[PDB]
């Protein structure tokens, strides 16, 4: 299906899909695209309307340029943002640990105002970071990701509250711009209004209008119908335009003699000067769109007319008089309603180009703020535009931005799915956003406007629920910064293919139809009565007359990683949240067999993932290697393709790539040539197909305990790859320099014979913990020794040296081979930070077996750990004797509500078994509709079911009715889907048939070396005497409070005196009790906690005669 | 009458409410550490004490010459505020901030707050001879047994 190298996979799609899935990176690729302003961006945002497209940099230019001095005698201008070429490829930049950047030119001009001057000078504005075709960024070699930050859109926010004293209705509105002060038009509990701008206690409406320069007559004429404000014109208590506007300036400061400045011009510096009060371009459009303004206009500005202000005055009073509709002179009529808070039309998305746009904006806000200052103090006629530009704070703002931001994070590269789902991700918190503890549990929940645009399922389980959203499949970004959704439009019961991108705002007015609808061959409905939703979102049931718009598909509320999860409709959404979150934490294996049953996502997923070799040009294969593929294009030229071999992740997983095709194949542009990670044959794979059992057995599946079979470890089918990196340098100190050498202080030679000529170890050594990695040695100084050891050195006749034996050794519980050796040096032209002479890096990889306790799960949210690795013979097995793989427990079924595994158990055994339905005379009613041509199956088959349109239940029972056996005539699995099994321990058959079958499982990343910690004696803090715990530290175990309460509840106080004293803080006891353990003598009495006495000294510091008696 | 009664009961005096000598805490509670590469770190209190000693020597030299009183109440006032910022920053007027416009740590800052007596003592801490790992079932064991 529109994929060149696709393997066949049979589906249960009852419907079609008229529109294909869009490109998934287009949320990020088309976002970049725009600050540059590509020619592809030019035509792309030129064919879909988009009359006069302007560049993102240009958007800061034409508002920034021209630059004008306070004297008005000279001027400075900017023009033409453009870009140079790249300086290094991605493999070099990731290799040589730099930024992936390209130069930037902007042609500026100084223009004198006294006589006119043409100082035009294309100035190198600095380096500029660049996005890959993978959608990524490289900072110091690190691959980092920009997170999308959801914010509320600026504009007009109407609201009505009801008080609890007199229970009546006050009507307010808060109107927010971008980067300015606020203003609120409220209604009092009494009469009348609430018109304090920037929170100065109250204003009246009329003094805003009369001091705005309008008669009290036109208050009656335009706003007298609208009779509650007649009381404002009664109790306005000041007659006179400036006579009340002086009192307005008294409301401003207070206490300053007003002039003709502070009458109108200062007010028009808050609302009619567009240099400090500048609402959003979309917020402009939102003002027009709400207020029913002159909206057929190509306009662009950020200026605030007062006519909109009196418009929202009269809309406000028509609201609080009780109405439904409203028109305006000169503009479109508006249905009167209150506003929503968390509606999507009120909450937009700052994209990365808007983010970086803000960072360039503040970068010129910090850059130019001395340039206009130096328009005076620099010498006239002696200034070139080069002498006025400091390019330094701009790139300081860029590198400042990519560092220390919680919107820039590392790529989670441990699953191509996980790397995909780190993108398309919707975040609420951040700079320019809310505070985490200081935001209530009301923005967290979902609202019916969330439908079709953001999936409500994917969120982390911890303290982030409602904070992290996930973008759906068919969404698309508004150039204004919103979500747009295509919908099928039906006229008179004729569904068109007319794909119309739509927002939720206009969707409120309109009629959204049903996906699974009885549609008859044209767009015509069998039934006349259809379920539908109102603007409230309530589910109503309507006759087939009003319907203009139809759904495009099922799965519209479903995100990407959500869409890979079959039989969702039969299990709990909470469990779906669990295992849906779990699949990003999968690990790669070394085999990558395709899953037996999936959907139409996985083949569609990895082709947009970009870890797999996609054929660029339709040609023929010339010659491949183990490491490269030299293709033959149909028109002349060739191209080689270097696949990446065993690249280290951010988490230490394997990024090896491998060829899948031959040397002479006629291939087409877009096809798969070679895959890398967990993918196979064009589609993802998180594990293997395994034979499952559903009985409880000997407490070894006791409350989600999981067991295994012996074959898998010996057939190595779950083997993992883990690369751990170590790094140390050679530096300089005050006394001298650090030394990397083969010369060691007092040491064995067995620990040296695997090291090279110059320190470091050689290729392919197998280490154990405590072995020495890099030979590092520093000078001591000049100290003295004890006379006794100095005697012994004379006895053994060997002074050592005046140096220190401080070398690099391996941390613990670690083994494996070292593959790569990377090493730098300051004298060898290497750029690396100061004080350092020489650098080295080590890459240590290791095959790891699967063992007990590791984190295992199935796709339906079921999970658990490995209790016992059995032998091969104590095992349930068939009448044909075939041993089982794992056994799952019964009671995870009822209370966790997860029967989809049972569903795919039956369907999975149907797939391994294969069928050929014997309806040679008449098709049964279960199979009477679904597809045709499906009633056979060659076993070991390749099948799929979509999300909501897959199989139905009688069909599932129907496929079991054909049972193509393994070798002989043998119905091992009955029509109820159970088998008769033998004891693998004593031998006898079991007196009940048992549910068994196949299930596709997976493996995660919580290995037993990761969370193990242990310590008897190690390092301590320097502030306190407490043990210190980190990565290379042994770790320490934090002992709490309620713990101590329970220790009191025993009353085992000698234990407590052991715990808080000799184990925590008293230094002089530790030597005593440790040495007593050494000699095996008595436990000494615990002395005074000296950490306690520290408090007493603090009290004695502050004029306190404290004393003990 | 409560507090006049309080001085009335005990064998104390209100002499300590004014001071003519200021104690100094031991130095290891304001310890100074140099990292590798010559990277120095220490406590905030030390330069505050330096403001104290510079004002005491400054006044101390300035009295001996003699002065108009405008200087005198100025220097004594700076001395009093130095004592105040030594004990508790931010109580009187603007808090003393340093680099980054962030407030410093006074004596009460070591005592009050999220480094308080709970948060120093009763917060609990980590000790050795301990560990942690993941767990599985031991169904063949006994109650007194463990693996």
């Amino acid at each position: 299906n529109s994929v060149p190298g696709a393997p066949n996979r049979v589906s249960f799609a009852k419907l079609r899909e008229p529109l294909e899935v869009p490109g998934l990176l287009d949320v990020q690729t088309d976002s970049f695209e725009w600050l540059i302003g590509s020619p592809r961006w030019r035509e792309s945002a030129a064919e879909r309307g988009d009359v006069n497209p302007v560049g993102g940099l240009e958007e800061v230019l034409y508002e920034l340029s021209p630059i004008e001095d306070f004297s008005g005698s000279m001027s400075l201008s900017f023009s033409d943002p453009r870009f140079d070429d790249v300086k290094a490829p991605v493999d070099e930049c990731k290799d040589k640990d730099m930024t992936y950047a390209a130069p930037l030119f902007v042609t500026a001009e100084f223009i004198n105002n006294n006589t006119g001057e043409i100082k035009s000078q294309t100035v190198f504005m600095g380096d500029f970071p660049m996005m890959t075709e993978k959608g990524t960024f490289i900072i110091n070699g690190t691959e980092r990701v920009v997170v999308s930050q959801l914010v509320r859109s600026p504009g007009v926010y109407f609201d009505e509250t009801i008080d609890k004293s007199t229970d009546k209705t006050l009507h307010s509105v808060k109107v927010i711009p971008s980067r300015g002060a606020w203003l609120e038009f409220d209604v009092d509990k009494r009469d009348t209004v609430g018109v304090r701008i920037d929170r100065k206690r109250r204003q009246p409406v009329t003094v805003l209008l009369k001091a705005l320069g309008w008669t009290s007559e036109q208050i009656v004429e335009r706003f007298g119908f609208s009779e509650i404000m007649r009381s404002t014109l009664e109790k306005d208590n000041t007659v006179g335009t400036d006579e009340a506007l002086l009192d307005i300036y008294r409301k401003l400061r207070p206490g300053e003699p007003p002039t003709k400045e502070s009458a109108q011009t200062l007010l028009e510096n808050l609302f009619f000067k567009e240099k400090r009060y500048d609402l959003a371009r979309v917020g402009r459009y939102k003002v027009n769109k709400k207020l029913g303004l002159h909206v057929g206009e190509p306009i662009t500005s950020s200026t605030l007319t007062e006519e909109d202000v009196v418009a929202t005055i009269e809309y406000l009073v028509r609201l609080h008089e009780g109405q439904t509709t409203m028109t305006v002179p000169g503009g479109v009529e508006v249905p009167v309603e209150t506003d929503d808070i968390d509606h999507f039309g009120n909450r937009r998305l700052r994209t990365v180009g808007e983010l970086i746009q803000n960072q360039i904006r503040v970068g010129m806000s910090r850059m130019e703020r001395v340039v206009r200052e130096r328009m005076t103090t620099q010498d006239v006629e002696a200034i070139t535009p080069q002498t006025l530009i400091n390019i330094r704070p701009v790139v300081a703002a860029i590198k400042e931005f990519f560092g220390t931001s919680q919107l820039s994070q590392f790529m989670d590269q441990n699953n191509p799915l996980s790397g995909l789902t780190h993108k398309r991700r919707l975040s609420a918190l951040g700079p320019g956003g809310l505070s985490r503890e200081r935001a209530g549990l009301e923005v967290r929940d979902v609202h019916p406007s969330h439908y079709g645009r953001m999936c409500p399922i994917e969120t982390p389980e911890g303290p982030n629920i409602g904070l992290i959203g996930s973008l759906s499949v068919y969404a698309r970004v508004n150039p204004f910064g919103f979500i747009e959704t295509p919908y099928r439009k039906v006229v008179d019961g004729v569904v068109s293919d007319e794909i119309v991108y739509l927002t939720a705002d206009e969707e409120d007015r309109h009629v959204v139809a049903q996906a699974n609808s009885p549609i008859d061959a044209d767009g015509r409905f069998v039934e006349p009565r259809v379920l539908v939703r109102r603007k409230a979102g309530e589910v109503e049931y309507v006759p087939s007359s009003e319907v203009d718009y139809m759904d495009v598909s099922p799965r519209q509320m479903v995100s990407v990683a959500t869409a890979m999860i079959p039989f969702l409709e039969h299990d709990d959404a909470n469990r779906a949240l669990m295992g849906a979150n779990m699949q990003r934490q999968a690990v790669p294996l070394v085999r990558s067999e395709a899953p037996l049953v999936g959907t139409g996502m996985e083949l569609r997923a990895a082709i947009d993932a970009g870890d797999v070799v996609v054929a660029e040009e339709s040609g023929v294969i010339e010659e491949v290697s183990a490491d490269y593929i030299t293709v033959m294009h149909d028109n002349g030229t060739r191209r080689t393709y270097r696949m990446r071999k065993f690249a280290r992740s951010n988490h230490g997983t394997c990024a090896n790539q491998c060829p899948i095709v031959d040397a002479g194949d006629r291939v087409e542009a877009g096809q798969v040539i070679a895959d890398g990670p967990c993918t196979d044959d064009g589609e993802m794979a998180l594990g293997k197909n395994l034979l499952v059992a559903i009985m409880p057995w000997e407490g070894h599946n006791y409350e989600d305990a999981i067991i295994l079979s012996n074959r898998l470890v010996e057939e190595d089918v779950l083997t993992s790859i883990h690369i751990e990196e170590h790094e140390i340098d050679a530096r300089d100190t005050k006394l001298g320099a650090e030394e990397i050498t083969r010369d060691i202080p007092n040491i064995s030679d067995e620990v040296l014979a695997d090291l090279d000529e110059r320190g470091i170890v050689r290729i392919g050594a197998e280490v154990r913990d405590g072995d020495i990695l890099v030979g590092k040695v520093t000078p001591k100084g000049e100290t003295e020794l004890t006379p006794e050891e100095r005697l012994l050195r004379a006895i053994f006749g060997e002074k050592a040296r005046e140096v220190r034996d401080t070398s690099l050794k391996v941390p613990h519980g670690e083994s494996g081979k070292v593959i790569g050796i990377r090493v730098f040096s300051r004298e060898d032209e290497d750029e690396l930070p100061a004080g350092v002479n020489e650098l080295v890096r080590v890459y240590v990889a290791q095959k790891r077996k699967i063992s007990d306790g590791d984190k295992l799960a199935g796709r339906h949210g079921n999970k658990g750990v490995i209790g016992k690795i059995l032998p091969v013979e104590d095992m349930p097995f068939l009448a044909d004797g075939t041993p089982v793989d794992i056994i799952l427990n019964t009671h995870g079924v009822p209370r966790r509500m997860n029967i989809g595994q049972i569903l795919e158990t039956h369907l999975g055994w149907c797939a391994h078994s294969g069928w050929k339905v014997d309806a040679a005379k008449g098709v049964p009613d279960w199979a009477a509709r679904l597809p045709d041509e499906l009633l056979e199956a060659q076993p070991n088959a390749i099948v799929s079911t979509p999300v909501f349109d897959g199989a139905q239940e009688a069909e599932l029972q129907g496929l079991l009715s054909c049972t193509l056996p393994n070798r002989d005539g043998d119905v091992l699995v009955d029509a109820d889907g159970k088998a008769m099994l033998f004891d693998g321990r004593s031998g006898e058959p079991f007196p009940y048939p048992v549910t068994v079958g196949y299930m596709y499982i997976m493996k995660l990343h919580h290995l037993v070396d990761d969370k193990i910690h242990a310590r008897s004696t190690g390092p301590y803090s320097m502030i306190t005497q407490q043990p210190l715990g980190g990565k290379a530290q042994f770790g320490g175990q934090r002992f709490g409070e309620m713990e101590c309460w329970a220790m009191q509840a025993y009353g085992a106080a000698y234990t407590l005196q052991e715990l808080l004293t000799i184990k925590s803080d008293d230094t002089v006891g530790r030597v005593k009790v440790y040495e007593a353990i050494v000699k095996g003598e008595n436990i000494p009495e615990p002395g005074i906690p000296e950490s306690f006495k520290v408090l007493l000294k603090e009290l004695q510091s502050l004029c306190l005669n404290v004393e003990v008696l | 009458l409560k507090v006049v009664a309080a001085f009335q009961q005990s064998g104390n005096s209100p002499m300590g409410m004014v001071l003519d000598a200021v104690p100094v805490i031991p130095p290891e509670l304001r310890p100074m550490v140099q990292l590798d590469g010559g990277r120095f770190a220490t406590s905030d209190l030390n330069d505050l004490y330096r403001r104290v000693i510079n004002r005491n020597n400054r006044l101390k030299r300035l009295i001996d010459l003699g002065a108009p009183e405008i200087i005198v109440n100025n220097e004594k006032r700076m001395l009093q505020e130095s004592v105040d910022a030594l004990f508790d920053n931010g109580r009187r007027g603007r808090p003393v901030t340093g680099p980054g416009n962030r407030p410093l740590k006074s004596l009460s800052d070591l005592l009050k707050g999220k480094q308080g007596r709970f948060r120093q003592n009763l917060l609990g801490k980590r000790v050795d001879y301990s560990g942690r790992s993941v767990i599985v079932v031991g169904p063949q064991l006994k109650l007194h047994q463990c693996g």
């Binding site: 009469d191 018109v195 206690r201 109250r202 207070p254 | -």
Partner: peptide, 24 residues
Amino acid sequence: FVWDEDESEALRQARKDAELTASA
């Protein structure tokens, strides 16, 4: 009549703090 509430007190609050910080 477009006096709100607590505004003379807000002058006493911001003034009671204002001569305090001005006298600081």
